[PDB]
From Swiss-Prot, chain B:
Oligomer and partners: Processing of the precursor of protein E3/E2 into E2 and E3 results in a heterodimer of the spike glycoproteins E2 and E1. Spike at virion surface are constituted of three E2-E1 heterodimers. Interacts with 6K protein.
Top-level taxon: Viruses
Official protein name in the record: Spike glycoprotein E2
TM stretches of this protein: 1-17
Function as written in the Swiss-Prot or TrEMBL entry: Plays a role in viral attachment to target host cell, by binding to the cell receptor. Synthesized as a p62 precursor which is processed by furin at the cell membrane just before virion budding, giving rise to E2-E1 heterodimer. The p62-E1 heterodimer is stable, whereas E2-E1 is unstable and dissociate at low pH. p62 is processed at the last step, presumably to avoid E1 fusion activation before its final export to cell surface.
Span within the parent record: 693 to 744 of 1242
Subcellular location: Virion membrane; Host cell membrane
Species name: Eastern equine encephalitis virus (strain Florida 91-469)
Length: 151, 52, 151, 151, 151
């Protein structure tokens, strides 16, 4: 996958994901993307649904495909491990869930992105992730568990 | 002069209420171009036509 | 060699070549030279000779030297092949000469630059080159075939 | 040691060493630090010692300890030689000490920073170099010999 | 040695060490003691010196002998490592410096307590400890670094 991070004062505090046609970036992080082609894009602020602008030209579109409907609750891919929940997100162990790990996509077994993490630092022995997804008909929803600090 | 200020204030308030509805008409559907759009939410309440 | 390209919106669309003392950049392309040393130099306008100020620092001067008159027909090397003519350049076969090839110097067998390619994308059976040339006694001229679209 | 050098128009013009408590940068030389973490340090002017304010965060501070006063007249390891004196400075072999390479710390056998060079380009067959030093009880005193020249 | 964790709601949140003549307990933590014979100890608040009342009887007196001044900067028997400085605490690496382990003593090579830790969660690359020391003749000193969160 291709996921350009976000630089601020030398450290990495967020990640920017690219889906087919559009470029994603979390609102909670501040900084400049390392891709100079992506810096000229006029990203616009929006509501909690995290709408940005895919103003990239034709030569590199459709990097990955967003996952469609008919979601099973089985195995799913993740950068730091695996998640196995559809209605919620899985209770992943420690290590993942620190700081500056926002914007990392959650992929399927065919390489299709299903969700993008935004929060849920630590909730005890079981950590829940606050992600965005599509509920039933492709309409973008935002699911947030209780006590989900911005992560 | 007091009358024409009331009409001017109330026009730019309702049209910004309608523009916020216009922005939220399309925002749940721009993030997924693959999702189908209903014909009720395209022309009557909102403005956008079928594209791509 | 020493030829720093010009990038606009993160994409290479032109090449800037340095000759003895002065840097030459085509003004029908836009962007910024990626060298931080080169970007501090002012730019002054001219004709389609495509002149830029030679305010280079002392540590880098006299990199490539130009070639005077008494130029043979000969065979001259080129970055994507070879060109063998004197009055104009060789009409190279198709495929060579895409987009973003402007400002490429044409060198001799001793490394002496004799031309800078500007236009002539397509010229029928084979594509002729619209270059700038030093004439029979050391004055720079510009040779253009008819119907030569710029790069 | 980890001493970031100054940069001016590509080539080097001096070395800005980092000592615990206050980073040291000569204001006699010019340029900007290419490191992003040290670019956020506020440039505050100082006295004739050519000193930059030490606004470094405390975690990467005191990695390089500094030697105190009452130094022996024994061996001291210069970066390109060796100095053996206490009050004055011992002779260095000729050739070293050109232009734009000052600010290199003079260390000891224990690795502690003893002195920070500022001058001493060429002073005859016996090479004496103008330096800052700690005189008897920790007072930071600059000592310049007769006929000194900035470096 | 002999140290007592503080019982608060089932989890450990602080360590109450005992010195010969007077017991100790961190003021910024709370809970119940883990000894039946320490339940009669009169709890009181005090200044920033972390002063408690060691009214334990003679049956368990003289557990850990205190250490005088003139502490050498050599090795010290920290419970999770070592400390090799006198005026400041040694830069302990990452991992150590979690949460809920205040009041842990620092031992000498002769089995003598020299210090009691209070805080310093995390400072960044290294870690500084807000610890108590004795300055010159046995006068109790509380020493803190800049930006030390209690720990």
């Amino acid at each position: 996958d291709k996921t350009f991070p976000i630089m601020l004062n030398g450290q990495v505090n967020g990640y920017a994901c690219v889906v087919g046609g559009r470029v994603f970036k979390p609102l909670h992080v501040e900084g400049r993307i390392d891709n100079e082609q992506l810096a000229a894009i006029k990203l616009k602020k929006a509501s909690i649904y995290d709408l940005e602008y895919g103003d990239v030209p034709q030569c590199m579109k459709s990097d990955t495909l967003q996952y469609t409907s008919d979601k099973p609750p089985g195995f799913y891919n993740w950068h730091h491990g695996a998640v196995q929940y559809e209605n919620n997100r899985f209770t992943v162990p420690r290590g993942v869930g620190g700081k500056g790990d926002s914007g990392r996509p959650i992929l399927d077994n065919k390489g299709r992105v299903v969700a993008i993490v935004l929060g849920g630092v630590n909730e005890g022995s079981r950590t829940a992730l606050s992600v965005v997804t599509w509920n039933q008909k492709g309409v973008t929803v935002k699911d947030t568990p209780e006590g989900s600090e911005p992560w | 002069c007091t009358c024409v200020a009331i009409i001017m204030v109330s026009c730019v308030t309702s049209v910004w209420l309608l523009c916020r509805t216009r922005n939220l008409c399309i925002t749940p559907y721009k993030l997924a171009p693959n999702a189908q759009v209903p014909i009720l939410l395209a022309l009557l309440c909102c403005i956008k036509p079928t594209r791509a």
